[PDB]
Amino acid sequence: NHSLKPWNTFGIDHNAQHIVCAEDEQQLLNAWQYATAEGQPVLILGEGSNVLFLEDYRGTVIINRIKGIEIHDEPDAWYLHVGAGENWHRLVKYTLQEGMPGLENLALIPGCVGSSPIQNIGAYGVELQRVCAYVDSVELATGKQVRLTAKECRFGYRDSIFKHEYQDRFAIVAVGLRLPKEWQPVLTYGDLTRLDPTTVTPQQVFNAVCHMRTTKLPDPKVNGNAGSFFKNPVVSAETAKALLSQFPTAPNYPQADGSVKLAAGWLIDQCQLKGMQIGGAAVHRQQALVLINEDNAKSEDVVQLAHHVRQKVGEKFNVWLEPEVRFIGASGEVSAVETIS
Ligand SMILES: Cc1cc2nc3c(=O)[nH]c(=O)nc-3n(C[C@H](O)[C@H](O)[C@H](O)COP(=O)(O)OP(=O)(O)OC[C@H]3O[C@@H](n4cnc5c(N)ncnc54)[C@H](O)[C@@H]3O)c2cc1C
Ligand SMILES: O=C1O/C(=C\c2cccc3ccccc23)C(O)=C1c1ccc(Cl)cc1
């Protein structure tokens, strides 16, 4: 019925039975019961910057546009209650304008605020769990409100409880953020290490990060994409050691649990996949992990190319990449790994 092309950054042109913009929590709950009473599946979307529509969605797509930014003062920090429909970068830009630093490393990350805790948005040595106080959700079937604390969200690398037992039944309506008044700059990543720690300000980091991302990362407006198509593979300590014996120059960081996060873009580049094209789908020439809609790409083309990238990295390194972009079937979420396997 209705084209989803304007509602996803990848530029995939599939149809949805019905599309509605929810301005508040109750309108989202109302749109749920109706579609659910009609026997339709319901998909809660934000800005669509990390979704891959595989085919026509045979249901209702509720676009979360719940606005609001409340500020609460405590002696040692600022507490922000932000609506799920708020643009993330606009919020990051707003907080720095009001003199509330903390989100400057997460600048220019696309998508809404409601989607930020789902895969714990992270960039330049900072993740959302660092500043997340809580996340508000409504049980879609009943309309009952639930406030999960930062600990209850079970944040990990591109992972949270909203990708598991809170995935299907719940819709995020608000996100709580704690910004410490005693600001501590995170400058241990890339070209931010070249900033002077003694004189660095939140705005200098924000402007630096925005310039780094604009010049280096692929823009969906030039060629449609959903950021990094694959996650940076988090492998075991022994698996990382065996790989580093053969490939000692492989970029890697040790994790809290003792696992090892390997660079996906590096592994893909080492297989000579830059510029590889399956139809309209293409691997970007700078950021190899970013798949792009180069020329009227089918959703099959992207899945076909993603499989080919996964297989070549798998045969060379014995490391099997998992998609960070979420795959949407005809009736809702599907296993992205099983689709590319
Ligand atoms: C150029 C580019 C760069 C990117 N860089 C990064 C980066 O550096 N770091 C990073 O972590 N991510 C990055 N991303 C991915 C993206 O910014 C995030 O994953 C973001 O959280 C998605 O927000 P969205 O509103 O667009 O979500 P959508 O794509 O609309 O939705 C994503 C998923 O979350 C679900 N969802 C959305 N809202 C709700 C809700 N209210 N309740 C329940 N489920 C919901 C959807 O059902 C879907 O399954 C990038 C993307 C692009 C295109
Ligand atoms: O360019 C990147 O390097 C990333 C991660 C790493 C960078 C440098 C060293 C690393 C070492 C180990 C693991 C990851 C990285 C990354 O995560 C992106 C990225 C993020 C978003 C988009 Cl859209 C494109 C690329």
Catalytic residue among 116, 160, 228, 299: 228
- At CA 72, angle to CA 69 and CA 73, rounded to 5? 145
Resolution expressed in Å:
2.5
Q: What is the CATH number of the domain that holds 59?
A: 3.30.43.10
157 is in an annotated binding site: no
Instruction: Kindly state whether residues 109 and 144 are assigned to the same domain.
Output: yes
Instruction: Kindly state whether residues 168 and 180 are assigned to the same domain.
Output: yes
Q: What is the CATH number of the domain that holds 271?
A: 3.90.78.10
Instruction: Kindly state whether residues 204 and 121 are assigned to the same domain.
Output: yes
Task: Print burial letters for 4-19: b (CB count within 10 Å at least 16), e (below 16).
Answer: beebbbbbbbbebbbb
The residues, ordered by sequence, that sit 6+ positions from 268 with a Cβ below 8 Å of its Cβ are 230, 274, 283, 288, 289, 309, 313, 321
State phi, psi for 328 to the nearest 5 degrees: -110, 115
Nearest to 209 by CA among 223, 189, 229, 224: 189
- Which DSSP category does 192 fall into? G
Nearest ligand, CA 116 = 1
Is 228 tagged catalytic? yes
Method underlying the structure: X-ray
Is 158 tagged catalytic? yes
- At CA 175, angle to CA 218 and CA 327, rounded to 5? 45
Q: What is the CATH number of the domain that holds 178?
A: 3.30.465.10
Output the CA torsion sign for 297, 298, 301, 307. positive
Residue 55: domain span: 1-67
Instruction: Kindly state whether residues 4 and 134 are assigned to the same domain.
Output: no
Q: How many domains would you assign to the chain?
A: 3
Is 98 tagged catalytic? no
Instruction: Kindly state whether residues 34 and 54 are assigned to the same domain.
Output: yes
161 CA → ligand 1 middle, Å:
15
Nearest ligand, CA 251 = 2
287 lines ligand 2 (CB under 6 A): yes
- Which DSSP category does 159 fall into? B
